Structure formats: C-alpha cells, structure tokens
Design a protein around this ligand. Structure first.
Ligand SMILES: Nc1nc2[nH]cnc2c(=O)[nH]1
Ligand SMILES: Nc1nc2[nH]cnc2c(=O)[nH]1
Length: 613
C-alpha cells in the first residue's frame, strides 16, 4: 500500500538506473544513521539507490528496505559480507537496457518470495506440531512422524461411489508415469513392498531426483526380472507373487511401522489376465489390510466390460502418462499403523465402475504434457488431513501460515484473530496494492496492531517478524538469507514469543519508515511527538508493530539513562535506526474518537492497561 524497497545496485550498474522512471537515492557514505531514515522515508514507491554503505550492518539495511542487486556475488558491510539478493548476468547489463534490467529484477523478486515463507515455515517446524492451510510445500519439508499436517486442499479427479467429473483445469508435463507415481504416493510410508518393480530403472530415477525420501524408506521390491540393487535400503526379491504369503514372511511384526503396498504387475487370444492380475493385487492388499496402511494397486480398464467391480478407496488418472495410456491407479486406504490419519478417506470397499466413465477420465486428464498440477493435488489430498483451520480446536501447539486471509474466509474476521491469539505462528495479508499471484484480502493494519498484541503474542509485519527471528534465533533464521522486505511487509505475522527483557528498541520493532510523509498526508486529508507519533502509526495503517512491547519499551525502558541503556543494547545484540502515559492514553482516545464502531474495543483494553499498567 505504501511500503517500498530500496533497489540497491553496485557501482557498475548505477549509470543505467539514471535512465529509469523511478526515484534515485544517491550516497555518499556520510550519512549519519538518522540521515538514511529521513531520506529513505521520502520515497513513496520503490527506489533505486547507489553509492557507499560500508558503515552499516545488514539488519540495519533490511529494516530500511534493501535489495542488493549487482553483477558481483557479494557486497561488503560492517556486519558481514552479504550474498547479493539479485545477481545480474554480465551480458545483460551491458547492453545497458533499463528494461531487460528492470524485468530481470522482477523475476528473482518473485523467486525471492519463496525464501521469506521458508524462514517462517522453517521456524514453525521448530516450535509446532499441528499445521494449518497446508500444501505440498509444507508436506515436502515435514517430519511425518511428528508434525501433523492439516488443511483443505483442492480435490483432484476421482472415481468411487461416486462420480462428479470433471471439470478440466490447465496443466503441464511432469516426470514419466512410474516415477511420477512414487512421487505422490511416497510420503509417510516407512517400508514399501513394491510388487512388480520391473528392472528398477523406475525406482532408481526416483532416487536420482528425490534422494531424501528414497533413503528415509525401506524397499522390498518383487520381480522374476528384478536385478541385484547394491543399495542397503533395498532388499530384493526375485520370487513372483501369487499369494500374500510371499510378502508376509518378510515383515518384522515385533515393531510398529507404516507400510505401503504398491502393485504393478503385468505379464505376456484376449487378456482377462490383465484383469485377474489387478484383481489379485487388490485381494492381496485386502487380506493384508490391517498390516499395510494403504495401497496403490495398478488398475487398467478393460474393453469387454461396460461395468465391473473392484476393491477401491479411489480411482484416479496418472500424471505424466501418455494420452492412450488407458490405466488408472487404484488407491486403497486401509487400517494398520500410520503416522497420517486417513479415516476421512473411506475404508476400501467393493466398487461398481462404468468403463466409459473411466474411459472419460483418461480422455480428460492424461497426456504426456499434463500432470504437474494433477500430481500435486493427488499428493496433498492423499497425505494432508482434511481439516478446517478457524474451526479446528487443537490440543497440541499449532502453526497457521499463508491461508488465513484467503478470500474464502472473508467476513469471518473474528475467528481469524482467535487463531492469532493462540497460534505459535500465523500470517495475515494487509497489503493494499493491486496485487497479483495473490488472491488474499487485507486486514486493516491498525485493527491488526490492536487485536494482535497479547503478553505472549508478539505482532509484527513480515520484515519486523523476520528481523526478530534473525536476532533471537540466529540459526533458525540466517542473516545471509535472501528475501524481499517489501513483500515481507505485505504480511502481518504473529508469534508466541515473549517480550525481551529488557524491552530494547530493536529494528524488529522500531522502523517506522516514511512516518513523516505518512504524518503529512494524514493532515491534508483527514486532519485531527511521542503522543502524536503513536496516533499517526494507527491512523495510517501503513504500519504493523507490536503495540504491547513497544509500550513496554517506552515507559519501562526510556528513561533508563544514557549510560545504563546501551549497555543493555550490547548485550541484547540489538540495533536501531533512530537516536508520558497521558499522551498515549489520549493517543488512543483521539484514535477512537475518529473510530467508533469500526473498532476498537480495545482501545479500552489498551487504555485500561496504561491506567493500571
Ligand atoms: N512468500 C511466500 N512464500 C511461500 N511459500 C509457500 N507459499 C508462499 C507464499 O504465499 N508466500
Ligand atoms: N508428488 C509430489 N508433488 C509435488 N508438488 C510439489 N512438490 C512435490 C513433491 O515432492 N511430490
């Protein structure tokens, strides 16, 4: 809505910037601290800035809005030697196109979005178990035997009771059928009896792309034609399978384990053998249902039969599989130990299927050049627990990232705060620009600031949030981390995180970039300094800081003295950018003088927490 970034470039770039349409900020390594803060605050959009910044730490620079573009790998600071956020290729200076240069920034900026949500997420996996509004990404980095991953994924093309299909959605190519299979089914298994594994090329390429989960899992594999695979998490079996006893003897029963049954069995005049193969793969899974957690039975569709039967939880189309591949994979969820509770997905039963409706599924969703987006949906739907965030009442501690402010939740505002009163970590869209690849809606920043802050609950904007994590848990959140602060500043973030002792004015907390331009607009438009300053912050909705702590920082902390208060900075390894209650109490008042109803309680809460402290 207001928040910008300083697109910082290194010397050799500068000349081309001049030729742009955005404001340029020039340095000049002196510049006091309180110099940057007043200048940077003049820029109501993104800026370009160059020249010497040796004096300064990174935190200092990110709180200011910095993104480090250059041709060189890194740039020298006072803190450390930072990895440039945005490297430019030589040739694409160089050239000296302002446009290809400006485009080049954009892309990496959208790529930078990732790193931001990787820090918050990567902290959540540190402090939590339950998990809400999740997706493949969160599955991807989860520990399936600890974190418990809920959410509401977008349900794929399915056949059971039960039809509905389609409709079609846009999609792109992926990994060939057989490794694109493994990819979505393998997640929480611990042991896999892979029946009919062929020559193993399949599973090896699975290793070659997805190495972690290949090793975090155990593979019995079965074929007349399977070679000796030197791997030690691979016990091979040449034995062909007619009975469930050719698997059974090869499971340790004295210990609990999630086990997965994968069937893929084909041989060599009609073929109602193709049939009683699949049907067998099913019966064998079934008899064992109670030792496996689930199964992916192969399921090709016959010509002869218009309708037929099978045991099924689901039947679905196959990513990366050719268009003419007339073969669905049949899921069976089962009973048997599993670190993911799937009792939503119905207990695999007998299923009447109509060939032509399967025939249609293949027709709609198969294609070499389709699957990517299907596979995802399958993955989630299979392994996420279908549970609604604002409604789930949890016993364990719980994280709430990047779903909260979704357009489907619109109106249900109260429930939202309820979640941010008690989550470990959660985030709300508060950005007021156009604003794309993002389908969220904004919460009023004042209302966030005021409802957000509780003793335990620290309420910062994404950048503050990050700065904080850098500063408190330096190795949950690295310092060299690349991210785009502007974007970080579209999110309100909340953490179950105690106030510092002593409540130092760290950047995580105190930035207030542009608060002077912010105070003037305020006064030409809707007109009514630590008294007025608090009011500005609120009325602007430019800002999201932790009211509570910042309160505590003012009264309980300043005074203290000159000597005795920096000192307690050293120490708390804090850092700043800027070198009584009766103000604040009116600050509040004035605020709600202008805002009956559109708020604020609460307010009342805040006042009555000064008038008692
Ligand atoms: N910054 C950011 N990172 C993510 N990682 C997964 N989803 C998101 C998102 O919406 N934003
Ligand atoms: N099946 C699958 N789909 C994904 N979509 C994004 N990441 C993954 C992954 O690891 N596996």
């Amino acid at each position: 809505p207001e928040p910008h970034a300083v697109l910082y470039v290194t010397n050799e770039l500068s000349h081309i910037v001049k030729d742009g349409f955005l404001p340029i900020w020039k340095l000049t390594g002196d510049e006091s601290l309180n110099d940057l803060w007043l200048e940077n605050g003049k820029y109501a959009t993104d800026v370009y800035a160059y020249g010497d910044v040796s004096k300064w730490t990174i935190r200092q620079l990110r709180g200011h809005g910095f993104i480090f573009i250059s041709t060189h790998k890194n740039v020298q600071l006072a803190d450390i030697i930072k990895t440039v956020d945005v490297r430019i290729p030589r040739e694409v200076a160089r050239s000296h196109d302002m446009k290809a240069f400006e485009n080049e920034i954009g892309r990496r900026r959208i790529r930078m979005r990732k790193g931001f949500g990787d820090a918050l997420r990567n902290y959540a996996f540190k402090m939590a178990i339950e998990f809400h509004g999740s997706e493949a990404e969160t599955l991807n980095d989860a520990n399936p035997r600890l974190h418990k991953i809920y959410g509401m994924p977008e349900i794929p093309p399915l056949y059971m009771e039960y039809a509905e299909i389609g409709t079609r959605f846009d999609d792109e190519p992926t990994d060939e059928k057989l490794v694109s299979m493994l990819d979505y089914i393998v997640y929480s298994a611990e042991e896999v009896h892979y029946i009919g594994c062929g020559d193993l090329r399949t599973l090896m390429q699975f290793k070659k792309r997805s190495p972690g989960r290949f090793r975090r899992v155990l593979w019995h594999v079965y074929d007349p034609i399977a070679p000796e695979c030197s791997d030690p998490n691979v016990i091979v079996h040449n034995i062909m399978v007619d009975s469930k006893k050719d698997i059974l003897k090869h499971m340790n029963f004295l210990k609990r384990v999630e086990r997965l049954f994968i069937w893929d069995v084909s041989s060599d005049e009609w073929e109602t053998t193709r049939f009683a193969e699949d049907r067998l793969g099913e019966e064998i899974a079934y008899e064992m249902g109670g030792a496996f957690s689930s199964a992916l039975i192969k399921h090709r569709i016959p010509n002869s039969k218009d309708e037929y039967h099978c045991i099924s939880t689901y039947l679905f189309p196959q990513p990366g599989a050719d268009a003419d591949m007339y073969e669905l994979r049949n899921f069976m969820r089962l009973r048997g130990y599993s670190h993911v509770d799937r009792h939503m997905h119905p207990d695999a039963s007998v299923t009447k299927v109509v060939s032509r409706d399967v025939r249609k599924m293949v027709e709609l969703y198969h294609g070499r050049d389709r699957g990517r987006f299907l596979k995802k949906r399958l993955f989630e739907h299979l392994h996420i627990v279908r549970k609604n965030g604002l409604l789930h009442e949890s016993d364990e501690p719980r994280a709430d990232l990047f779903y909260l402010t979704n357009r489907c939740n619109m109106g249900l505002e109260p429930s939202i705060y309820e979640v941010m009163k008690k989550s470990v970590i959660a985030t709300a869209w508060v950005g007021r620009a156009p604003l794309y690849d993002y389908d969220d809606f904004a919460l009023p920043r004042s209302t966030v600031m005021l409802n957000g802050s509780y003793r335990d609950i620290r309420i910062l904007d994404g950048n503050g949030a990050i700065l904080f994590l850098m500063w408190r848990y330096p190795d949950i959140v690295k310092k060299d981390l690349t991210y785009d602060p502007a974007w970080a500043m579209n999110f309100a973030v909340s953490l179950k995180e105690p106030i510092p002792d002593p409540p130092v004015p760290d950047i995580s907390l105190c930035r207030f970039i542009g608060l002077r331009v912010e105070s003037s607009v305020l006064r030409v438009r809707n007109p009514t300094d630590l008294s007025g300053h608090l009011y500005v912050t609120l009325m602007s909705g430019a800002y999201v800081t932790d009211l509570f702590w910042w309160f505590k920082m003012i009264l309980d902390w300043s005074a203290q003295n000159r000597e005795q208060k920096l000192r307690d900075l050293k120490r708390s390894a804090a850092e700043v950018i800027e070198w009584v209650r009766n103000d604040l109490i009116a600050a509040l008042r004035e605020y709600k003088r202008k805002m009956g109803m559109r708020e604020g309680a609460s307010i009342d809460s805040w006042l009555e927490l000064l008038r008692h402290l």
